[PDB]
Subunit: 330 residues, 5 copies
C-alpha cells in the first residue's frame, strides 16, 4: 500500500522518537595518506526499524526481499559520516541496496559504501609511531528527540573480514562506542564510533635509513688510522663522506612527512652529519699544529695525540648516543 500514504513524514511524526538500530561489517581498509591525514574504508551498513505503514497480510511470518527501486518511495533514515571528505555508494551493476520487510512492518535496509575520513596523526616518534583512528556515524536532520540511534547488538554489532590487511601497518583493537553531540544552532544528536589502532612496521625504515648512515659514520673513522703526512688522502675521504651523507639525507627527505617538529629519524641523521663534520674539523686542526711545529723547529735550527685520543673518544660518543636514543625511542 505504497500509494495511500505520505512518506515525507517519519513514523510517529509528531510523537515520540523512533528507535533505529545499526549494524556494520567492515570489508577492507584501502589506503592511508600521511600528507592528507586520512584513511579510506569500505563497509556494509545495515539499519533496523519498524513502520506500521509497510505491513501486509501473510501466513508465513517471514521476511520478503524487494527489488530496491522501492527505497525511493518510502521513508528511510538519513545517516551520514561526520568529518568525512568524500564518499559514494557502489552502483554496479545496480545500486548495492537491499530491502527486506516482515508482515508486521519490521524493515532491514543495507548499503555498501566507501568513505574517506580524516584523523589527527602525530609523527613525533615516526617511524616508531602508533596511531588511533575512528569513523563516526550520525543522523543529519533528526535530533535525539525525533530519532534515537543505537548499536543493534551492543558490542556484538561490529564484524571484520579476515582479509583486512595493510602493507605498512598492523591493525588491531576494533571496538565501538557512543557519545552525544551538540550543535549550537540545531540541537542534540547521538554519535556512534568505530575505533581501531595502527602499528607501523619498522624493518624497511631501519634497513633503508639507519644502516647507511651508521656505515658512513664508521667510515669517517678510517681517517684516524691513516698516516697524517698523506694530506691528499685524508682530506678527500672526509669531504666525500660529507657528500655521501648529504645525498643520503636528500634521498630520505624525498619521502618524508613534514611537520612543525622533527621526527626521531631526522635527529639520527643530523647527529650523524655533525659527527662527520667534526671529524673533518679535527683533521684540519691536526695538520695546522704539525705545520706550526715544523716552523718552530726550523726557527730553532709518531701518531699525534689528537688522533690517538679521538680513536677512543669518537666511537664512545656514538655508542653512548645510540644507547640513549634506543633507550628513549626503544
Amino acid at each position: 500500500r505504497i500509494d495511500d500514504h505520505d512518506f515525507s513524514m517519519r513514523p510517529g511524526f509528531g510523537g515520540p522518537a523512533i528507535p533505529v538500530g545499526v549494524d556494520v561489517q567492515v570489508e577492507s581498509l584501502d589506503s592511508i595518506s600521511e600528507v592528507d591525514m586520512d584513511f579510506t574504508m569500505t563497509l556494509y551498513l545495515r539499519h533496523y526499524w519498524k513502520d506500521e505503514r509497510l505491513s501486509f497480510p501473510s501466513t508465513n511470518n517471514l521476511s520478503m526481499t524487494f527489488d530496491g527501486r522501492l527505497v525511493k518511495k518510502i521513508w528511510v533514515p538519513d545517516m551520514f559520516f561526520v568529518h568525512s571528505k568524500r564518499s559514494f555508494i557502489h552502483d554496479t551493476t545496480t545500486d548495492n541496496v537491499m530491502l527486506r520487510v516482515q508482515p508486521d512492518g519490521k524493515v532491514l535496509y543495507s548499503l555498501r559504501v566507501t568513505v574517506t575520513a580524516m584523523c589527527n596523526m602525530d609523527f613525533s616518534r615516526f617511524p616508531l609511531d602508533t596511531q588511533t583512528c575512528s569513523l563516526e556515524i550520525e543522523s543529519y536532520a533528526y535530533t535525539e528527540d525525533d530519532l534515537m540511534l543505537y548499536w543493534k547488538k551492543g558490542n556484538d554489532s561490529l564484524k571484520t573480514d579476515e582479509r583486512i590487511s595493510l602493507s605498512q601497518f598492523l591493525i588491531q583493537e576494533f571496538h565501538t562506542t557512543t557519545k552525544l553531540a551538540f550543535y549550537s544552532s540545531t540541537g542534540w544528536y547521538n554519535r556512534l564510533y568505530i575505533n581501531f589502532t595502527l602499528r607501523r612496521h619498522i624493518f624497511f625504515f631501519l634497513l633503508q635509513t639507519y644502516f647507511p648512515a651508521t656505515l658512513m659514520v664508521m667510515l669517517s673513522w678510517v681517517s684516524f688510522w691513516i698516516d697524517r703526512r698523506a694530506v691528499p688522502a685524508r682530506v678527500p675521504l672526509g669531504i666525500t663522506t660529507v657528500l655521501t651523507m648529504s645525498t643520503i639525507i636528500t634521498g630520505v627527505n624525498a619521502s618524508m612527512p613534514r611537520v612543525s617538529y622533527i621526527k626521531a629519524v631526522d635527529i639520527y641523521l643530523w647527529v650523524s652529519f655533525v659527527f662527520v663534520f667534526l671529524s673533518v674539523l679535527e683533521y684540519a686542526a691536526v695538520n695546522y699544529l704539525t705545520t706550526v711545529q715544523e716552523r718552530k723547529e726550523q726557527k730553532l735550527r709518531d701518531t699525534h695525540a689528537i688522533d690517538k685520543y679521538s680513536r677512543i673518544i669518537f666511537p664512545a660518543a656514538y655508542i653512548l648516543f645510540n644507547l640513549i636514543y634506543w633507550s628513549i625511542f626503544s
Copy 2:
C-alpha cells in the same frame, strides 16, 4: 499545500525584497595548494526565511522536520560561492539536507558542502610569510532589490570546530564582513565574507635548508688553515664543497614555489654559493702569486698574507650578512 501554489516565484514576487539570514559553521580546512593558490573548506550552511505559502495548522508553535525530498518542490534561496573553482554537496547515504518548517511559515534550510576557493598569496617572505584568505557567499539570480542577504546573528553567526588543523600552518582570526558588489550588466548584489589568517611554521625549513648551507660555508673555510704547499689537497676540497652546495640547492629547488621575484631562502642559498666560489678563487690567487715569487727567485739566482687576512675577513663578512638578513626578515 505544496500542489496548490507555483513555487517558481519567490515569496513576495512583484513586491519588496525578501530578507534572508545566513549562519555558517566551519568543519575543517582540508588542504592548501601553493601551485594553484587555493584552499578547500567543508562547512555547514544555514538559511532563514519566511514563506506564508508553507504555513500549516498546529497548537504548539514548534518546528517539524520533513524528509528533505520536498526541497525540490518548494522555493529555496539560490546562493553560490564567488571566485571558487569547484564544489559539491555530500550525498551519502542520502543528500545531506535538513528542512524544518514552523506553523507560521518560518523555514530553516541546512546543507553540508565542500568548496575549493582561490586566494592571492605573496611569497616574497617565504618561508616566513603570512597570508590572508577569504570565502565569499552571494546570491546569483536576485539583485538587492529582490533578495536582502545578511548575517543572521551579527558577528556571532560564525562558529568553528575545535579540530580545525593544518600540518604546515597556524590558523587564527576568523571573522565576518559584508560588502556590496556591482556587475555592469546585471545589477547590485550584497556579499558575505569569511576571513582568516595563516602563519607558517618555520622549524622544518630552518633545519632542512639553512643549517646545511651554513655548515657547507663553514667547511669551505678549513682550506685557509691548510698548508699552501698541499695543492692536491686544497683544490679538491673547494671543488667538492661547490658540488655539494649545488646538489643541496637542486634538492631544495625541487619543492619550492615559482615566482617572478626572489624569496628569502633563495637569497640565502645563492649568497652561500657565492661565498664558496670566492674561496676557490682566493686559493687560485695564492697559488699563482707563490709561483711568480719562485720564478723571480730563480731568475735572480710562512703564511701568505692572503690566507692570514682571509681567515678573519670571511667569517666577519658572513656574520655581518647573517645579522642584516635576520634583522630584516627575523
Copy 3:
C-alpha cells in the same frame, strides 16, 4: 504487457528459487598497481533466466532485440563484484545494455563493465615472484533460497580476447570455480570466481639493477692490484665506489615496493654494499700495518700479505654468494 505486472517482485515470488546462468567474455586487463594492490578489468557479463511475465505471441521461436530502455521497467538480477574498489558501466553513445527476449519468456541480458578489484600480493621473491588473482561475482539482496546462481556452461563459460597482454606480466591459466559464502546477519550466497596467474618478466631488472652492482664490486676489487705506496690513489677509488653504489641504491629504491619483509633485490644490493665497505677497511688496515713497521725499523736504526690473500679471497666469496643466491631464488 509491461504495464500489467509489478516488477518489484522477482519471478516465482514466494516460491522456489529462480535459476540464473552467467557467461563472461574478458575483453582486456588494463593495469596492475603494486602499491594499492589491485587490478583493472573490462568484461562482457551475460545473464540468463526465464520470466513468464515477458511472453508474447509469435510463430518463430526466435529472439527479438529490444531497445534497452525497457531494462528499467522489468525485474533484473542485481549482481555485484565482491572486494572491488570501484566500477562503472560504459555509456557512450548510450548505455551498453542488450536485451533479447524469446517468445516463451527466456531472457538474455548483457552489460559492458570495467571493474577495479583488490588482490593480495607476496613480494618476498620480487622481482622473481608469481602472483595469483581472482574476480568474484555474487548477488546482493537474494540468498540461495531466493536465487540460484551458477555457471551457464560449466568450464566452457569463460572466454578471453586474443589481445589480452600486459607489458610486465605473462598471463596464463584462466579458469573458474564456485564457493558458498556466509554473512552472519543476512544468509548464505553462492560466489562465482574467475582465476588467473601472472608471471613477471625479469630481463629489465637484470639489466638495470644486478648488472651495475656486480660491475661496481669488480671495479672495487681493482684496489688490490695497485701498489700500496700510492695512498692518494687507493683511498679515493674506494670512497668513490661507495658513493656510486649508494647513488645506484637510491635510484633503484625510487621504483621499488615497500614491504615489512626483505626482497631478494634488497639482499643483493646490500651484500654488494658491504663488500665495498669491507674493501675500504682492508686497505686502511694495510696502510696502518705498513706505517707501524716503518716506525719500528726507524726506532731500531714487495706485496703485503693481506693484498695477496685478498686477491683470491674476495672473488671466491662473491662467487659463492652468487651461487647460493641463484640456487635459492632460481
Copy 4:
C-alpha cells in the same frame, strides 16, 4: 503559458533566422599546462533573444526573475566551445542559472561555466616566449540560416575581473573578433573569438639556470692559472666541473618542455658543457707536450704557450658567444 506550447521548435520555426546576442565577463584564468598545451578559464556567459511565446501582462514594463527550473521547459540557445577538452556548469548550491523575462518576451539567460581548451604553443624561444590564445563560441545544431550569433554590444561586450593574474605570466590585450566557419556535411556557422596574449616572466629562469652555468664555466677557467706540474690538482678540477655541469643539466631537464626542435636554454647549457670539455682537452694536450719534451731532453743529456694563450682566448670566445646570444633572442 508554458503548458500551452511545444518548445521543441525555435522561435520563428520555418522562417527567418532568430538573432542571438552574447555578452561575456571573464572571472579567472585557473591554470596553464605546457605539457598538454591548454588553459583553464572561468566566465559568465549571457544570452539575449526574443520569444513572444513567453509574454505576460504587466503594468510596469519591468523584467522579472524566475526560479531557473523553467530553463528545462522552454527553448534555449545551444552554444558550445569549439576545440575544448572538458567543461562543466557549477551547480552548488543549485544550478548557477539566471532567467529574466520582460513582459514583451525579451529573455536574458546567464550561466557560470569553467572551460579547459587548447592553446597551441611555440617554445623555440623558451623561456623568452610570447604565446597567444583564443576561446571560441559557436552554435552546435543551428546554421546561420536558422540562428544569427553576434556580439551584443561590440568591443564593449567583453569585461574582465580586476583580479585576473597568473604566477608565471603577464596577461594583456583582451579583445574580440568574429569569423564564419564551414563544415562539409552540415553547413556554415558563426564563431565568436576571445583573444589574449601571455608573456612569461624571465627572472626566475635567469637566476636558476643561466647563473650556475656561467659560474661553472668561470670555475673551469681557473685551471689555466695553476702550475702545470700539479697534475693531480688540475685533472680532478676539470673532471669535477664536468660532473657538476652534467648534474645541473639533469636537474634543469627535469622541468623542461619536450619538443622536436631546440629551445634557447638548451643551446646555452650545451655550449657551456662543450666549453668545460674543451678546457679538459687543452690541459691533456699541455701535459702530453711537456712529457715529450722532457723525455727528449733527458735522452740528449715557465708558463707553456698553450696556457698563456688559453687565458686570453677562452674568456673572449665566451663573451662573444654571450654578446651574440643575448642579441638574437633579445
Copy 5:
C-alpha cells in the same frame, strides 16, 4: 506524432535489417600514454537512417532542425567504441546533440564525443620506432541480420582538422576499413576502422641522451695520453667518469618506457658504460706490470706498449660499433 508510436522497437522490427551510414570528422588527438598504451581523440560522429514513423507534412522538401530533447523519445542507433577505456559526451552548455528530420522520415543525428582507446605499441626500436593505431566503431545490441552498418561515402567519409598535431609525433595516413566480427554467444557484427600512423621525432633524444654518453666515452680516452707515473691523476679520472656515466644513465632511465626486451637506447648506453669500465681495467693492468718490472730491476741490481696500442684500438672499436649500430637501426 511521437506519442502514437512505440519506439522500443527498431524500424522494420520483425523484417529485414535497417541500413545505417556513418560519417566522422576528427577534431583533435589529445594525448598518447606509453605507460598505459592508449590515446585520446575528440570527433564528430554522424548517423544516417530512414524512419517512416517520423514523417510529417510539408511544402518545401527541406530538412528541419529540432531541439534535441526529442532524442530520448525516438529510436536511435546504439554505436559504441570497441576496446575503449573511457569515453564521454560533452554537455556544455547543453548536450552537444543535433537532430534533423526530412519530410519523408530521413534522419541526421550527430554527437561530439571524446574516447580513450588502447593500442599495442612496440618499443624495440625506441626512440626510432613507428606505431600504428586504430579506432573501432560497432553496434552493441543488433547483429548483422538486424542492422547493416557501413561508411556513408566510402573512403571519403573521414575528414580531419587542419590543426591536428602532436608535440612528439608526426601524424600521417588516415584511412578507413571494415571487417566482420564474431562473438561466440551473440552473433556476427560489422566493424568500422579509423587508421593512422605515428612517427616519433628524434632530435630531443639525440641531444639529451646520445650526445653526453659519447662525450664521456671520449673523455675516458684522455687517460691514455697522460704520463703513467701520475697514478693519482689517472685513477681519479676513470672513477669519476664511471660515476658520471652512471648518473647520466639513471637520469635518462627515470622517464623511459619499460618492456620485457631491450631498447636501442639501452644498448648504446650500456655499451658506453662497458667501454669506460674497460679503460679503468687497462690502466690497472699497466700499473701492475710496471711495478713488477721495477721489482725485477731491483733484484737484478718509455711509453708502455698497452697504452700505445689502446690509443688506436679503443677509438677504432667505438667507430666500428657506431657504424654497425647506425646501419642496423637507421
